Every structure is written in C-alpha cells, then in structure tokens.
Amino acid sequence: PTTTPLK
C-alpha cells in the first residue's frame, strides 16, 4: 500500500 492524502 501507499499513502497519498488529498484534502
């Protein structure tokens, strides 16, 4: 898995 917030 990979984290990539977007908010």
Ligand SMILES: *[C@H]1O[C@H](CO)[C@H](O)[C@H](O)[C@H]1NC(C)=O
């Ligand atoms: C995490 O980053 C990886 C790097 O390519 C992918 O883009 C993947 O889709 C990302 N996961 C999420 C949940 O955005």
